[PDB]
Amino acid sequence: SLLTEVETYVLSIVPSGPLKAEIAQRLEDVFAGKNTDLEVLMEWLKTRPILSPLTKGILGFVFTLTVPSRRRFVQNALNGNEDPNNMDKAVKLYSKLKSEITFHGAKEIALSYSAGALASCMGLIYNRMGAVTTEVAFGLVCATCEQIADSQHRS
Amino acid sequence: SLLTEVETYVLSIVPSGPLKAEIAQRLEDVFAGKNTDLEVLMEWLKTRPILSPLTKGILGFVFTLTVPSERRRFVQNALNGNEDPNNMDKAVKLYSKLKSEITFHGAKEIALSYSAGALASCMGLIYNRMGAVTTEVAFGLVCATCEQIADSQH
C-alpha cells in the first residue's frame, strides 16, 4: 500500500534508535496530510544526529515529495561526488524513468544502476520534481535505499 | 573587461526597448555595485512583459552571479526547460568540463561547441549548483549561450 512500501525502504537505512521512531511518525503524519509544514520538518531534519548527510537527503527528498506545499543540505548530499560517470548514468537512468508510470517499474530499472548514480539521479530530480510521476520518484528513493541496505551486511 | 563583455552578449538577445534600456541600466547599475537587492530585482524581472521567459532566466542567472543578497522557480523553469534528456546528457558533460576551466574565453570556446538547448540546460545546472563553477567561467557560458541564440536570429 504505497506508504507502507516507502515507509519500509526509507525507514530501513535509518539507524536503529529513537530517531527511527520520530521519523516514522512524521512519515505517516505527512502521508496522511496531518502536519505538512515542509520547512518545519526540514529544520528538524537538518539538526538530527546519527543520520548521515545522504540519509538526510533521501529523507528530505521524500518529504519534499509527499507534501502539497528547496534546501542546500539535501541537495548537496544527493549530488555529492558529482562524479562525471555517476552523473552520466544518472542522466541515462532519468531519461528511462520519464517513460515510467509505476513504482515498480521505476524501482526495477533503478536497481540496474549504481548507488552513486541513484544518488545522483535523485539530486537531479530534487530540482525537477515534476519531471517524473510521483510513484516513479518513490521507486527511485526506494531502490536507492534498498541497495544502501544490500551493502550494510556482516561477515 | 568582462562585465561589459557579458553585457553586450546579454543585450544581444533582447529586442530594442527601451525596456532594453531599463535592462542595460540595471546591468550597469549592479556591475558598478549599486544599491541592489536580488529579490526586488528578480521580482521586477519576473513581472516584465515582452521578455520571453528564457530571456528572463538568462538575465536572472546573470544577476544572481553579480548581486549579493545570499532560488527562483521562473529562472529555473526557463533554463532547465522541458527537463529534456538528450539536452541534460550534453549539459552534464559540459558541466564537469566547466569545473576545470579557469578563464572566460576558455569556457566560451568549449561551450560554443555544444548546442544552445544544452547550453541553457547547463546554465540550469550551474544556477542550481551556484558555486561549482567560477564566475568568469559562468560568464563564458551565458555569452556562449547568447551568441548561439542571437546568431540563430536572422
Numbering used by the authors:
A (entry chain C): 2 to 70, 76 to 161
B (entry chain B): 2 to 71, 76 to 159
Paper text:
As the most abundant viral protein encoded by the M gene segment, matrix protein 1 (M1) forms a shell underneath a host cell-derived lipid biolayer to connect the vRNPs with the viral envelope in mature virions. The full-length M1 protein includes 252 amino acids consisting of a highly organized N-terminal domain and a flexible but less ordered C-terminal domain that are linked by a protease-sensitive loop. So far, only the N-terminal domain of M1 has been structurally resolved at an atomic level, showing that at neutral pH the physiological monomers have a high tendency to oligomerize via a so-called ‘face-to-back’ arrangement, whereas at acidic pH the N-terminal domain exists as a dimeric structure in a so-called ‘face-to-face’ arrangement.
In sharp contrast to M(NLS-88R), both M(NLS-88E) neutral and acidic structures are in a face-to-face-oriented dimeric mode and lack pH-dependent conformational switches. As for M(NLS-88E)-acidic structure, it contains two face-to-face-arranged dimers. On the other side, M(NLS-88E)-acidic has monomers A and B associate in a face-to-face arrangement to form dimer 1, and has molecule C similarly associated with its dyad equivalent to form dimer 2. All three M(NLS-88E)-acidic monomers superposed on each other with a r.m.s.d. of ~0.5 Å. However, least-squares superposition of the two M(NLS-88E)-acidic independent dimers 1 and 2 resulted in a very large r.m.s.d. of 1.2 Å, indicating that the two dimers of M(NLS-88E)-acidic show significantly different dimer arrangements. Dimer 1 of M(NLS-88E)-acidic is more like M(NLS-88E)-neutral dimer (r.m.s.d. of ~0.6 Å screw rotation angle of ~8°), but not its dimer 2 (r.m.s.d. of ~0.6 Å screw rotation angle of ~15°). However, dimer 1 of M(NLS-88E)-acidic is more like M(NLS-88E)-neutral that owns a strong bifurcated hydrogen-bond interaction between Tyr100 and Glu88 because of the G88E mutation that makes it more difficult to dissemble M(NLS-88E) M1 in acidic conditions than M(NLS-88R) M1. Dimer 2 of M(NLS-88E)-acidic is significantly different from all other obtained dimeric structures by showing neither apparent contact between Asn85 and Arg134 nor apparent inter-subunit interaction involving Glu88. Dimer 2 of M(NLS-88E)-acidic likely represents an intermediate conformation due to incomplete transition after the pH drops.
